[PDB]
Design a protein around this ligand. Sequence first.
Ligand SMILES: Cc1cc2nc3c(=O)[nH]c(=O)nc-3n(C[C@H](O)[C@H](O)[C@H](O)COP(=O)(O)O)c2cc1C
Ligand SMILES: CCCCCC/C=C/Cc1[nH]c2ccccc2c(=O)c1C
Ligand SMILES: CCCCCC/C=C/Cc1[nH]c2ccccc2c(=O)c1C
Ligand SMILES: O=C(O)c1cc(=O)[nH]c(=O)[nH]1
Ligand SMILES: O=C(O)c1cc(=O)[nH]c(=O)[nH]1
Lengths: 335, 336
Amino acid sequence: YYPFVRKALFQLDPERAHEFTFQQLRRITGTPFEALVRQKVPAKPVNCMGLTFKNPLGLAAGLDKDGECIDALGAMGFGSIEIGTVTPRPQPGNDKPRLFRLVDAEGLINRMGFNNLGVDNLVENVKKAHYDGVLGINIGKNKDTPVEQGKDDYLICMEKIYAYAGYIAINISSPNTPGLRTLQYGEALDDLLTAIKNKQNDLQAMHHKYVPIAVKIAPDLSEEELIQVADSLVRHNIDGVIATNTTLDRSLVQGMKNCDQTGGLSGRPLQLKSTEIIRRLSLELNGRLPIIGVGGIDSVIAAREKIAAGASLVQIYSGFIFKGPPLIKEIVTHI
Amino acid sequence: MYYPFVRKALFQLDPERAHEFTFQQLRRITGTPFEALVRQKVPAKPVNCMGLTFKNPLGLAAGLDKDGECIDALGAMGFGSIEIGTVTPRPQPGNDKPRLFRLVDAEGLINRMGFNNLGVDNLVENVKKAHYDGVLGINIGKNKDTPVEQGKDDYLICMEKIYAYAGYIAINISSPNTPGLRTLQYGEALDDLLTAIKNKQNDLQAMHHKYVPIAVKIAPDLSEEELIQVADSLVRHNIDGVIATNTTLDRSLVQGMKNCDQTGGLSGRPLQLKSTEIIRRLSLELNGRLPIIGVGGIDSVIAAREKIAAGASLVQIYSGFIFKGPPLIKEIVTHI
Ligand SMILES: Cc1cc2nc3c(=O)[nH]c(=O)nc-3n(C[C@H](O)[C@H](O)[C@H](O)COP(=O)(O)O)c2cc1C
Ligand SMILES: CCCCCC/C=C/Cc1[nH]c2ccccc2c(=O)c1C
Ligand SMILES: CCCCCC/C=C/Cc1[nH]c2ccccc2c(=O)c1C
Ligand SMILES: O=C(O)c1cc(=O)[nH]c(=O)[nH]1
Ligand SMILES: O=C(O)c1cc(=O)[nH]c(=O)[nH]1
């Protein structure tokens, strides 16, 4: 029963509880000791972006920033695991405390700031993994890098991970990297997607391997902004879109502790917004490219809601914290 | 006391029997020191709606206590309002068993009860014995054999017998389980029914010297045009509120799941999203002119807040109560 584990883990600070949880998972990942966390789940393959996904449920990015527990996490059922976000150089991200739990809303607020050990380190961890699901590597801009030259940060990363990644996630949706979201808009975006799509072709010829590229978008786009983003992805033949990241919105959590904290809200208070975004995106993309729906998913029905709204795959993070491994099994089994 | 264990035990019984067994025990501990086995202390959150003052914004939706047999016990659990019914003028047995089905992985239900109830006179006798300090809703409908074009008579008969005792009156024209009933939601039929109902209200107010507000409970399967029509009629006829929404014929979210093809109304989590869309569109068309009670897949604080954001002034639960227990009454009332 996870509810008893969660009471205990919740007595610890959000980030401290994470550090502790992963300390443990790191001592067992890729060893027979992952029997402690293994959960059998039905096969439920899905073709998406030219890959076969073991099953439609994925671990959204942010949990295993550095790719330390891929094997252990896969043992829990995930048909895909998105590691990252990594950056070319390591950085510690924003200042603690930067992670807060809205328990009664089953949501999380975070201004982490791309806290990662960098891309070289991630690649070394990924070489130790033996995960038969699809591995996505999420990549981002270094804080100090000027947003005008952010492409350089993304292309460096692509070169080092291309040979080890199932799919690559372009993160331009973090509200905790100053100015980063602007990379979703206008000519900035068009500029970046051309860099990326060019490197991809290069790297395909270099490595003789086909790797899809997916852009992760924020949920706080306007209707016009979303129309422009959808048009852009289609025009640059981006293989997929991850919708969505965390939100600056707070309309559903007023009067709750840590409501006023700065950062991105996730979990149940993002569920509806995230579904709306996907539905409008689906209507715009009209089947021209797949959507990976993440945002507030915390039950079979909610997962299926994102499927009905247009998504070909779903990803979980906050609901994984609040409902634990059992959610993995519910969803894969019944989606 | 811990609900998930209570739930596991009760789910060993078929849904109708689980309910009957539960209600038998509630009835048995009403008026005893074992009434505290269920009493819950919840924060007061007073809201004015339809000219009444609700303890809190959370009501028990109609269907759980069809005959008003457990008002006191259900009230002890913390509901701000209790909607009993649906009742019909004459008693009637409803549709044939099996008629009620759990979708446990969906945290949903399907039902085709067909207004199984002892009749409006039996209920007023129960209501007289009740001691509930919250707002008492009373939900009325058409007897099966009564013709659809004459259905209003059955509603009016009921209003006459319940006016003295109702806190508000709910008009059920949204059951998918009584043939043709949902057609009273359309055109000249809605218009005619609302006229007769509002004129009865006027005669009854004059005869009892008090105004009992009337809310119409609509279905979630209306289209956009039908919903605008429903809004417009409710306003022009000065109906005091709308309760949105009842069960849905939709099954798109429960495909591939045991019982998903059983005929009837789907409720619980697979209805939350649609019930919210309805409320939002209804709210735009009503533009604050009359209040909306929000029922439909509410199973958590955020789900409740989502309905409020969509335009509802109050909310009700049924399925979520079954699946999550009184902890949900407390959670919502506390953080809504
Ligand atoms: C078994 C059952 C019986 C119901 N009976 C009635 C009823 O008699 N009158 C009514 O207006 N609604 C009735 N309903 C609808 C509920 O009041 C409620 O509107 C609906 O289930 C949606 O809310 P929910 O998702 O919380 O269950 C019934 C629902 C169920 C599941
Ligand atoms: C029992 C198997 C462990 C599965 C991992 C789920 C729990 C992780 C610990 C954890 N991480 C977090 C990560 C990010 C934000 C909040 C938390 C948080 O509040 C807790 C308690
Ligand atoms: C905590 C004490 C009372 C709690 C009330 C919640 C349970 C009510 C009994 C009940 N009704 C139902 C009504 C309709 C459909 C299914 C059920 C069902 O499966 C169960 C178990
Ligand atoms: O670490 C972060 O602030 C962050 C990154 C990202 O892509 N999304 C998010 O909600 N937070
Ligand atoms: O008891 C019933 O069949 C019934 C009545 C009603 O008004 N709504 C519903 O979904 N069922």
